[PDB]
Subunit: 261 residues, 2 copies
Protein backbone atom coordinates (compact mmCIF):
# COMPACT_ATOMS: atom_id res chain seq x y z
CA UNK A 1 0.00 0.00 0.00
CA UNK A 2 1.07 3.59 0.47
CA UNK A 3 4.66 4.11 1.51
CA UNK A 4 4.60 4.19 5.38
CA UNK A 5 5.86 7.07 7.53
CA UNK A 6 8.95 5.39 9.00
CA UNK A 7 10.31 3.59 5.90
CA UNK A 8 12.07 4.73 2.79
CA UNK A 9 13.00 1.20 1.48
CA UNK A 10 10.57 -1.34 0.06
CA UNK A 11 12.00 -4.65 -1.27
CA UNK A 12 10.48 -7.57 -3.06
CA UNK A 13 11.40 -11.25 -3.17
CA UNK A 14 10.38 -13.54 -6.00
CA UNK A 15 9.56 -17.14 -5.03
CA UNK A 16 8.71 -19.41 -7.98
CA UNK A 17 9.55 -22.62 -9.81
CA UNK A 18 12.04 -22.58 -12.66
CA UNK A 19 12.17 -24.95 -15.70
CA UNK A 20 15.49 -26.65 -16.13
CA UNK A 21 17.38 -25.42 -19.15
CA UNK A 22 14.64 -23.00 -20.36
CA UNK A 23 15.97 -19.46 -19.87
CA UNK A 24 13.28 -17.83 -22.03
CA UNK A 25 10.65 -19.16 -19.71
CA UNK A 26 12.57 -18.45 -16.46
CA UNK A 27 13.70 -14.96 -17.43
CA UNK A 28 10.17 -14.10 -18.51
CA UNK A 29 9.08 -15.04 -15.03
CA UNK A 30 11.69 -12.67 -13.56
CA UNK A 31 10.49 -9.93 -15.92
CA UNK A 32 6.90 -10.44 -14.78
CA UNK A 33 8.00 -10.25 -11.12
CA UNK A 34 10.08 -7.15 -11.75
CA UNK A 35 7.12 -5.30 -13.32
CA UNK A 36 4.83 -6.37 -10.53
CA UNK A 37 7.35 -5.40 -7.83
CA UNK A 38 7.89 -1.99 -9.43
CA UNK A 39 4.11 -1.34 -9.60
CA UNK A 40 3.86 -2.25 -5.93
CA UNK A 41 6.47 0.37 -5.10
CA UNK A 42 9.45 -1.89 -4.48
CA UNK A 43 12.83 -0.41 -5.28
CA UNK A 44 14.66 -3.79 -5.49
CA UNK A 45 13.72 -7.33 -6.45
CA UNK A 46 15.64 -10.35 -5.13
CA UNK A 47 15.36 -13.55 -7.17
CA UNK A 48 16.53 -17.19 -6.43
CA UNK A 49 19.77 -19.05 -6.97
CA UNK A 50 20.46 -20.19 -10.51
CA UNK A 51 16.86 -19.28 -11.45
CA UNK A 52 17.57 -18.43 -15.12
CA UNK A 53 18.65 -22.02 -16.00
CA UNK A 54 16.96 -23.87 -13.21
CA UNK A 55 18.73 -25.46 -10.24
CA UNK A 56 20.39 -28.28 -12.28
CA UNK A 57 24.10 -28.02 -11.51
CA UNK A 58 25.37 -31.06 -13.52
CA UNK A 59 23.29 -30.05 -16.61
CA UNK A 60 24.45 -26.51 -16.42
CA UNK A 61 28.07 -27.66 -16.40
CA UNK A 62 27.42 -30.14 -19.27
CA UNK A 63 25.12 -28.12 -21.48
CA UNK A 64 25.11 -24.37 -20.82
CA UNK A 65 27.77 -22.48 -22.63
CA UNK A 66 29.43 -19.22 -21.59
CA UNK A 67 27.71 -17.49 -24.49
CA UNK A 68 24.32 -18.70 -23.29
CA UNK A 69 25.10 -17.44 -19.74
CA UNK A 70 26.13 -14.04 -21.12
CA UNK A 71 22.89 -13.83 -23.08
CA UNK A 72 20.87 -14.42 -19.91
CA UNK A 73 22.99 -11.84 -18.01
CA UNK A 74 22.29 -9.25 -20.75
CA UNK A 75 18.60 -9.95 -20.59
CA UNK A 76 18.60 -9.51 -16.79
CA UNK A 77 20.56 -6.16 -17.00
CA UNK A 78 17.88 -5.07 -19.49
CA UNK A 79 15.03 -6.09 -17.08
CA UNK A 80 16.53 -4.00 -14.28
CA UNK A 81 16.81 -0.95 -16.67
CA UNK A 82 13.46 -1.47 -18.46
CA UNK A 83 11.41 -2.20 -15.30
CA UNK A 84 13.20 0.57 -13.42
CA UNK A 85 14.04 -1.66 -10.39
CA UNK A 86 17.30 -2.77 -8.79
CA UNK A 87 17.56 -6.54 -9.41
CA UNK A 88 19.59 -9.26 -7.71
CA UNK A 89 19.93 -12.42 -9.82
CA UNK A 90 22.09 -15.50 -9.72
CA UNK A 91 23.60 -17.19 -12.76
CA UNK A 92 26.74 -19.18 -13.44
CA UNK A 93 29.75 -16.95 -13.64
CA UNK A 94 31.18 -15.71 -16.99
CA UNK A 95 34.05 -18.21 -17.53
CA UNK A 96 33.99 -21.52 -19.30
CA UNK A 97 31.86 -24.30 -17.90
CA UNK A 98 34.70 -25.90 -15.98
CA UNK A 99 36.18 -22.65 -14.62
CA UNK A 100 33.03 -20.69 -13.51
CA UNK A 101 31.22 -20.59 -10.22
CA UNK A 102 27.73 -19.80 -9.04
CA UNK A 103 27.37 -15.97 -8.76
CA UNK A 104 24.99 -13.28 -7.71
CA UNK A 105 24.92 -9.81 -9.15
CA UNK A 106 23.08 -6.63 -8.28
CA UNK A 107 22.09 -4.20 -10.97
CA UNK A 108 20.64 -0.84 -10.06
CA UNK A 109 17.52 0.71 -11.52
CA UNK A 110 19.53 2.11 -14.45
CA UNK A 111 20.80 -1.32 -15.31
CA UNK A 112 24.31 -0.63 -13.99
CA UNK A 113 25.90 -3.73 -12.39
CA UNK A 114 27.04 -2.54 -9.04
CA UNK A 115 28.32 -5.75 -7.57
CA UNK A 116 29.17 -9.34 -8.42
CA UNK A 117 29.89 -12.14 -5.98
CA UNK A 118 30.91 -15.74 -6.39
CA UNK A 119 29.47 -18.30 -3.95
CA UNK A 120 32.25 -19.43 -1.58
CA UNK A 121 30.48 -22.38 0.11
CA UNK A 122 29.33 -24.90 -2.51
CA UNK A 123 26.69 -27.41 -1.34
CA UNK A 124 27.10 -31.11 -2.00
CA UNK A 125 28.91 -33.15 -4.53
CA UNK A 126 26.97 -32.04 -7.62
CA UNK A 127 27.63 -28.33 -7.07
CA UNK A 128 31.25 -29.01 -6.21
CA UNK A 129 31.64 -30.91 -9.48
CA UNK A 130 29.77 -28.35 -11.62
CA UNK A 131 31.26 -25.13 -10.23
CA UNK A 132 34.44 -23.59 -8.80
CA UNK A 133 34.12 -22.04 -5.35
CA UNK A 134 34.62 -18.31 -4.88
CA UNK A 135 37.74 -16.99 -3.16
CA UNK A 136 36.66 -13.40 -2.30
CA UNK A 137 34.73 -11.99 0.60
CA UNK A 138 31.16 -10.68 0.14
CA UNK A 139 30.87 -7.16 -1.30
CA UNK A 140 29.28 -4.34 0.70
CA UNK A 141 27.94 -1.19 -0.97
CA UNK A 142 25.71 1.74 -0.31
CA UNK A 143 22.29 1.57 -1.97
CA UNK A 144 19.05 3.19 -0.98
CA UNK A 145 20.44 4.61 2.24
CA UNK A 146 21.97 1.37 3.60
CA UNK A 147 24.91 -0.92 3.19
CA UNK A 148 23.86 -3.94 1.12
CA UNK A 149 25.70 -7.21 0.66
CA UNK A 150 25.28 -10.47 -1.25
CA UNK A 151 25.66 -14.11 -0.28
CA UNK A 152 24.34 -17.22 -2.05
CA UNK A 153 22.34 -20.09 -0.56
CA UNK A 154 24.54 -22.39 1.62
CA UNK A 155 26.89 -19.44 2.36
CA UNK A 156 24.33 -17.97 4.81
CA UNK A 157 24.34 -21.15 6.87
CA UNK A 158 27.96 -20.36 7.90
CA UNK A 159 28.14 -17.73 10.56
CA UNK A 160 31.59 -16.82 9.24
CA UNK A 161 30.12 -15.76 5.86
CA UNK A 162 27.57 -13.40 7.38
CA UNK A 163 30.12 -12.09 9.82
CA UNK A 164 32.46 -11.36 6.86
CA UNK A 165 29.74 -9.17 5.34
CA UNK A 166 28.84 -7.47 8.57
CA UNK A 167 32.57 -6.83 9.35
CA UNK A 168 32.71 -4.78 6.06
CA UNK A 169 29.68 -2.73 7.16
CA UNK A 170 26.73 -4.70 5.80
CA UNK A 171 23.29 -3.88 7.10
CA UNK A 172 21.09 -5.71 4.62
CA UNK A 173 22.27 -9.06 3.25
CA UNK A 174 20.50 -10.34 0.14
CA UNK A 175 20.54 -14.08 -0.50
CA UNK A 176 19.34 -15.92 -3.60
CA UNK A 177 18.79 -19.49 -2.54
CA UNK A 178 17.64 -22.97 -3.68
CA UNK A 179 16.69 -25.01 -0.60
CA UNK A 180 14.89 -28.34 -0.93
CA UNK A 181 14.16 -31.29 1.33
CA UNK A 182 12.12 -29.62 4.02
CA UNK A 183 15.15 -28.08 5.69
CA UNK A 184 13.21 -26.05 8.20
CA UNK A 185 16.19 -25.26 10.36
CA UNK A 186 17.72 -22.93 7.73
CA UNK A 187 15.03 -20.20 7.65
CA UNK A 188 13.64 -21.19 11.02
CA UNK A 189 16.78 -21.39 13.21
CA UNK A 190 19.88 -20.23 11.29
CA UNK A 191 18.56 -16.87 9.59
CA UNK A 192 17.17 -15.50 12.76
CA UNK A 193 20.53 -16.13 14.47
CA UNK A 194 22.49 -14.61 11.57
CA UNK A 195 20.37 -11.49 11.92
CA UNK A 196 20.62 -11.23 15.73
CA UNK A 197 24.27 -12.18 16.06
CA UNK A 198 25.28 -9.30 13.66
CA UNK A 199 22.39 -6.86 14.20
CA UNK A 200 21.41 -6.98 10.50
CA UNK A 201 18.50 -7.70 8.19
CA UNK A 202 18.60 -10.61 5.74
CA UNK A 203 16.41 -11.44 2.73
CA UNK A 204 16.24 -15.08 1.52
CA UNK A 205 14.52 -15.82 -1.82
CA UNK A 206 13.88 -19.48 -2.63
CA UNK A 207 12.53 -21.62 -5.39
CA UNK A 208 9.32 -23.53 -4.50
CA UNK A 209 7.80 -26.76 -5.66
CA UNK A 210 9.22 -29.52 -7.81
CA UNK A 211 12.09 -28.64 -10.03
CA UNK A 212 15.01 -30.67 -11.42
CA UNK A 213 14.20 -33.74 -9.35
CA UNK A 214 13.99 -31.90 -6.07
CA UNK A 215 11.18 -30.34 -4.05
CA UNK A 216 11.91 -26.76 -3.10
CA UNK A 217 10.71 -25.59 0.20
CA UNK A 218 9.66 -21.97 -0.51
CA UNK A 219 9.73 -20.27 2.78
CA UNK A 220 11.20 -16.97 1.43
CA UNK A 221 11.62 -14.56 4.23
CA UNK A 222 12.98 -11.22 5.39
CA UNK A 223 14.38 -11.30 8.93
CA UNK A 224 15.10 -8.16 10.90
CA UNK A 225 17.82 -7.47 13.51
CA UNK A 226 15.77 -8.88 16.37
CA UNK A 227 15.45 -12.14 14.44
CA UNK A 228 11.75 -11.81 13.67
CA UNK A 229 10.26 -12.25 10.23
CA UNK A 230 9.23 -8.96 8.69
CA UNK A 231 7.47 -10.95 5.98
CA UNK A 232 7.38 -14.57 4.80
CA UNK A 233 5.89 -16.90 2.21
CA UNK A 234 4.91 -20.54 2.51
CA UNK A 235 5.36 -23.20 -0.24
CA UNK A 236 3.45 -21.58 -3.02
CA UNK A 237 4.77 -19.18 -5.64
CA UNK A 238 4.58 -15.56 -4.59
CA UNK A 239 6.01 -12.08 -4.54
CA UNK A 240 6.85 -10.99 -1.03
CA UNK A 241 6.94 -7.22 -0.55
CA UNK A 242 8.32 -5.76 2.65
CA UNK A 243 8.82 -2.30 3.97
CA UNK A 244 12.08 -2.01 5.90
CA UNK A 245 12.13 0.49 8.79
CA UNK A 246 27.77 -4.76 24.79
CA UNK A 247 27.61 -5.11 20.95
CA UNK A 248 28.66 -8.22 19.02
CA UNK A 249 30.48 -6.70 16.20
CA UNK A 250 32.75 -4.50 18.31
CA UNK A 251 33.16 -6.98 21.21
CA UNK A 252 34.19 -10.01 19.23
CA UNK A 253 37.84 -10.84 19.82
CA UNK A 254 38.52 -11.32 16.13
CA UNK A 255 42.28 -11.59 16.49
CA UNK A 256 41.89 -14.59 18.68
CA UNK A 257 38.93 -16.06 16.73
CA UNK A 258 40.93 -16.06 13.54
CA UNK A 259 43.53 -18.35 15.09
CA UNK A 260 40.88 -20.76 16.44
CA UNK A 261 38.88 -21.67 13.34
Amino acid sequence: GLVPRGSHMRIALMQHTARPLDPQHNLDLIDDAAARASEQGAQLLLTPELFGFGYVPSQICAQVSAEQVDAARSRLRGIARDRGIALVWSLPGPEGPEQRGITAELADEHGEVLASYQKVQLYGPEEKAAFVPGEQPPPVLSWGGRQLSLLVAYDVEFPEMVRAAAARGAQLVLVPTALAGDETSVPGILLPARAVENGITLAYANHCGPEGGLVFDGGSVVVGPAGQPLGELGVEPGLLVVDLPADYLQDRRAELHRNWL
Copy 2:
Protein backbone atom coordinates in the same frame (compact mmCIF):
# COMPACT_ATOMS: atom_id res chain seq x y z
CA GLY B 1 13.33 -42.26 36.22
CA LEU B 2 15.07 -45.45 35.18
CA VAL B 3 17.99 -45.04 32.84
CA PRO B 4 16.50 -45.35 29.28
CA ARG B 5 17.57 -47.89 26.66
CA GLY B 6 19.30 -45.51 24.22
CA SER B 7 21.19 -43.25 26.67
CA HIS B 8 24.23 -43.71 28.81
CA MET B 9 24.61 -39.99 29.86
CA ARG B 10 22.30 -38.12 32.23
CA ILE B 11 23.18 -34.48 33.09
CA ALA B 12 21.73 -31.99 35.49
CA LEU B 13 21.59 -28.20 35.44
CA MET B 14 21.14 -26.12 38.56
CA GLN B 15 19.08 -22.93 38.17
CA HIS B 16 18.82 -20.82 41.35
CA THR B 17 19.40 -17.41 42.89
CA ALA B 18 22.69 -16.62 44.58
CA ARG B 19 23.32 -14.15 47.46
CA PRO B 20 25.96 -11.58 46.69
CA LEU B 21 29.11 -12.10 48.71
CA ASP B 22 27.80 -15.09 50.73
CA PRO B 23 29.75 -18.16 49.58
CA GLN B 24 28.62 -20.34 52.50
CA HIS B 25 25.06 -19.90 51.43
CA ASN B 26 25.72 -20.24 47.66
CA LEU B 27 28.03 -23.24 47.94
CA ASP B 28 25.54 -24.96 50.23
CA LEU B 29 23.01 -24.54 47.48
CA ILE B 30 25.40 -26.19 45.00
CA ASP B 31 25.97 -29.03 47.49
CA ASP B 32 22.23 -29.57 47.82
CA ALA B 33 21.86 -29.65 44.02
CA ALA B 34 24.78 -32.03 43.65
CA ALA B 35 23.25 -34.53 46.12
CA ARG B 36 19.88 -34.27 44.47
CA ALA B 37 21.35 -34.66 40.96
CA SER B 38 23.36 -37.71 42.04
CA GLU B 39 20.25 -39.35 43.61
CA GLN B 40 18.39 -38.74 40.36
CA GLY B 41 21.09 -40.59 38.46
CA ALA B 42 22.89 -37.66 36.88
CA GLN B 43 26.59 -38.12 36.26
CA LEU B 44 27.37 -34.37 35.94
CA LEU B 45 25.94 -31.16 37.37
CA LEU B 46 26.33 -27.81 35.59
CA THR B 47 25.99 -24.70 37.76
CA PRO B 48 25.76 -20.93 36.83
CA GLU B 49 28.33 -18.24 36.20
CA LEU B 50 29.98 -16.76 39.27
CA PHE B 51 27.40 -18.56 41.45
CA GLY B 52 29.64 -18.99 44.53
CA PHE B 53 29.96 -15.19 45.13
CA GLY B 54 26.91 -14.02 43.29
CA TYR B 55 26.92 -12.17 39.96
CA VAL B 56 28.40 -8.91 41.37
CA PRO B 57 31.46 -8.20 39.24
CA SER B 58 32.53 -4.82 40.78
CA GLN B 59 32.13 -6.19 44.37
CA ILE B 60 34.04 -9.29 43.56
CA CYS B 61 36.93 -7.20 42.23
CA ALA B 62 36.77 -4.84 45.26
CA GLN B 63 36.12 -7.29 48.07
CA VAL B 64 36.87 -10.92 47.26
CA SER B 65 40.42 -11.93 47.82
CA ALA B 66 42.38 -14.67 46.05
CA GLU B 67 42.42 -16.64 49.29
CA GLN B 68 38.64 -16.46 49.53
CA VAL B 69 38.32 -17.65 45.89
CA ASP B 70 40.67 -20.56 46.59
CA ALA B 71 38.61 -21.53 49.62
CA ALA B 72 35.46 -21.68 47.49
CA ARG B 73 37.31 -23.70 44.79
CA SER B 74 38.43 -26.23 47.44
CA ARG B 75 34.92 -26.56 48.73
CA LEU B 76 33.59 -27.19 45.20
CA ARG B 77 36.32 -29.87 44.46
CA GLY B 78 35.18 -31.50 47.73
CA ILE B 79 31.47 -31.43 46.63
CA ALA B 80 32.30 -33.18 43.37
CA ARG B 81 34.28 -35.91 45.30
CA ASP B 82 31.85 -36.22 48.25
CA ARG B 83 28.64 -36.24 46.15
CA GLY B 84 30.26 -38.52 43.58
CA ILE B 85 29.25 -36.32 40.59
CA ALA B 86 31.23 -34.46 37.93
CA LEU B 87 30.68 -30.73 38.61
CA VAL B 88 31.10 -27.65 36.42
CA TRP B 89 31.35 -24.41 38.41
CA SER B 90 32.39 -20.87 37.67
CA LEU B 91 34.42 -18.67 39.99
CA PRO B 92 36.92 -15.88 39.54
CA GLY B 93 40.26 -17.20 38.47
CA PRO B 94 43.13 -17.83 40.95
CA GLU B 95 45.20 -14.62 40.49
CA GLY B 96 44.93 -11.36 42.33
CA PRO B 97 41.76 -9.33 42.00
CA GLU B 98 43.11 -7.13 39.24
CA GLN B 99 44.79 -9.93 37.24
CA ARG B 100 42.11 -12.72 37.31
CA GLY B 101 39.28 -13.49 34.95
CA ILE B 102 35.96 -15.26 35.14
CA THR B 103 36.57 -19.04 34.80
CA ALA B 104 34.79 -22.34 34.59
CA GLU B 105 36.21 -25.61 35.76
CA LEU B 106 35.12 -29.21 35.48
CA ALA B 107 35.91 -31.67 38.20
CA ASP B 108 35.19 -35.34 37.73
CA GLU B 109 33.40 -37.59 40.18
CA HIS B 110 36.67 -38.23 42.05
CA GLY B 111 37.19 -34.54 42.55
CA GLU B 112 39.99 -34.34 39.96
CA VAL B 113 39.95 -31.02 38.05
CA LEU B 114 40.01 -32.03 34.46
CA ALA B 115 39.72 -28.68 32.79
CA SER B 116 39.83 -24.95 33.45
CA TYR B 117 38.78 -22.20 31.08
CA GLN B 118 38.86 -18.44 31.26
CA LYS B 119 35.98 -16.50 29.69
CA VAL B 120 37.23 -14.79 26.51
CA GLN B 121 34.23 -12.52 25.78
CA LEU B 122 33.52 -10.27 28.78
CA TYR B 123 30.07 -8.63 28.83
CA GLY B 124 29.68 -4.94 29.48
CA PRO B 125 31.69 -2.34 31.25
CA GLU B 126 31.45 -3.77 34.78
CA GLU B 127 32.82 -7.19 33.82
CA LYS B 128 35.51 -5.60 31.69
CA ALA B 129 36.59 -3.50 34.67
CA ALA B 130 36.43 -6.34 37.21
CA PHE B 131 38.10 -9.11 35.18
CA VAL B 132 40.79 -9.81 32.58
CA PRO B 133 39.61 -11.57 29.43
CA GLY B 134 40.88 -15.05 28.60
CA GLU B 135 43.35 -15.57 25.75
CA GLN B 136 43.04 -19.36 25.17
CA PRO B 137 40.61 -21.40 23.15
CA PRO B 138 37.98 -23.59 24.86
CA PRO B 139 39.22 -26.98 26.10
CA VAL B 140 37.82 -30.22 24.71
CA LEU B 141 38.11 -33.53 26.59
CA SER B 142 36.68 -36.98 26.67
CA TRP B 143 34.24 -37.65 29.51
CA GLY B 144 31.42 -40.13 29.73
CA GLY B 145 31.82 -41.30 26.16
CA ARG B 146 31.78 -37.85 24.49
CA GLN B 147 33.93 -34.83 23.88
CA LEU B 148 32.96 -32.10 26.35
CA SER B 149 33.89 -28.43 26.26
CA LEU B 150 33.36 -25.30 28.36
CA LEU B 151 32.34 -21.76 27.52
CA VAL B 152 31.00 -19.03 29.82
CA ALA B 153 27.90 -16.89 29.36
CA TYR B 154 28.39 -14.20 26.63
CA ASP B 155 30.99 -16.44 24.90
CA VAL B 156 28.20 -18.68 23.53
CA GLU B 157 26.57 -15.73 21.79
CA PHE B 158 29.59 -15.57 19.43
CA PRO B 159 29.45 -18.19 16.76
CA GLU B 160 33.26 -18.07 16.63
CA MET B 161 33.52 -19.30 20.24
CA VAL B 162 31.33 -22.34 19.68
CA ARG B 163 33.01 -23.05 16.38
CA ALA B 164 36.40 -22.95 18.19
CA ALA B 165 35.16 -25.71 20.51
CA ALA B 166 33.60 -27.77 17.77
CA ALA B 167 36.77 -27.41 15.61
CA ARG B 168 38.70 -29.17 18.48
CA GLY B 169 36.16 -32.02 18.50
CA ALA B 170 33.53 -30.85 20.99
CA GLN B 171 30.21 -32.63 21.04
CA LEU B 172 28.71 -31.33 24.27
CA VAL B 173 29.37 -27.72 25.27
CA LEU B 174 28.63 -26.80 28.88
CA VAL B 175 27.90 -23.16 29.65
CA PRO B 176 27.52 -21.55 33.07
CA THR B 177 25.67 -18.32 32.50
CA ALA B 178 24.14 -15.22 34.17
CA LEU B 179 21.59 -13.68 31.80
CA ALA B 180 19.22 -10.95 32.97
CA GLY B 181 16.91 -8.43 31.32
CA ASP B 182 14.54 -10.74 29.52
CA GLU B 183 17.01 -11.49 26.75
CA THR B 184 14.89 -14.10 25.05
CA SER B 185 16.92 -14.17 21.89
CA VAL B 186 19.90 -15.86 23.60
CA PRO B 187 18.28 -19.20 24.55
CA GLY B 188 15.51 -18.81 22.02
CA ILE B 189 17.41 -17.89 18.81
CA LEU B 190 21.19 -18.06 19.36
CA LEU B 191 21.57 -21.56 21.24
CA PRO B 192 19.51 -23.42 18.76
CA ALA B 193 21.67 -22.00 15.94
CA ARG B 194 24.91 -22.78 17.80
CA ALA B 195 23.75 -26.36 18.10
CA VAL B 196 22.59 -26.75 14.49
CA GLU B 197 25.45 -24.87 12.84
CA ASN B 198 28.02 -27.24 14.52
CA GLY B 199 25.92 -30.40 14.99
CA ILE B 200 26.43 -30.35 18.78
CA THR B 201 24.53 -30.32 22.06
CA LEU B 202 24.76 -27.36 24.44
CA ALA B 203 23.74 -26.99 28.09
CA TYR B 204 23.06 -23.46 29.48
CA ALA B 205 22.60 -23.04 33.25
CA ASN B 206 21.36 -19.65 34.44
CA HIS B 207 20.64 -17.81 37.62
CA CYS B 208 16.94 -16.88 38.12
CA GLY B 209 15.16 -14.12 39.95
CA PRO B 210 16.48 -10.97 41.54
CA GLU B 211 20.11 -10.93 42.46
CA GLY B 212 22.67 -8.11 42.74
CA GLY B 213 20.34 -5.49 41.30
CA LEU B 214 19.41 -7.49 38.26
CA VAL B 215 16.57 -9.86 37.37
CA PHE B 216 17.82 -13.15 36.02
CA ASP B 217 15.83 -14.79 33.37
CA GLY B 218 16.15 -18.51 34.22
CA GLY B 219 15.42 -20.30 31.06
CA SER B 220 18.13 -23.00 31.58
CA VAL B 221 18.09 -25.36 28.70
CA VAL B 222 19.76 -28.26 26.93
CA VAL B 223 19.63 -28.01 23.13
CA GLY B 224 20.36 -30.93 20.87
CA PRO B 225 21.97 -31.01 17.39
CA ALA B 226 18.69 -30.36 15.60
CA GLY B 227 18.26 -27.20 17.69
CA GLN B 228 15.36 -28.48 19.78
CA PRO B 229 15.23 -28.28 23.55
CA LEU B 230 15.79 -31.63 25.18
CA GLY B 231 14.72 -30.04 28.46
CA GLU B 232 14.11 -26.53 29.78
CA LEU B 233 13.15 -24.55 32.86
CA GLY B 234 11.19 -21.33 33.15
CA VAL B 235 11.90 -18.51 35.67
CA GLU B 236 11.70 -20.42 38.87
CA PRO B 237 14.52 -22.24 40.66
CA GLY B 238 14.93 -25.82 39.57
CA LEU B 239 17.12 -28.78 38.79
CA LEU B 240 16.82 -29.80 35.17
CA VAL B 241 17.73 -33.42 34.49
CA VAL B 242 18.14 -34.62 30.93
CA ASP B 243 19.02 -37.89 29.33
CA LEU B 244 21.25 -37.40 26.30
CA PRO B 245 20.87 -39.94 23.47
CA ALA B 246 27.23 -31.53 3.05
CA ASP B 247 28.46 -31.04 6.68
CA TYR B 248 29.28 -27.66 8.23
CA LEU B 249 32.36 -28.48 10.06
CA GLN B 250 34.17 -30.09 7.13
CA ASP B 251 32.77 -27.75 4.44
CA ARG B 252 33.61 -24.45 6.04
CA ARG B 253 36.39 -22.70 4.16
CA ALA B 254 38.26 -21.86 7.33
CA GLU B 255 41.37 -20.60 5.59
CA LEU B 256 39.40 -17.94 3.88
CA HIS B 257 37.11 -17.23 6.88
CA ARG B 258 40.10 -16.51 9.07
CA ASN B 259 41.19 -13.69 6.77
CA TRP B 260 37.68 -12.17 6.67
CA LEU B 261 36.84 -11.66 10.34
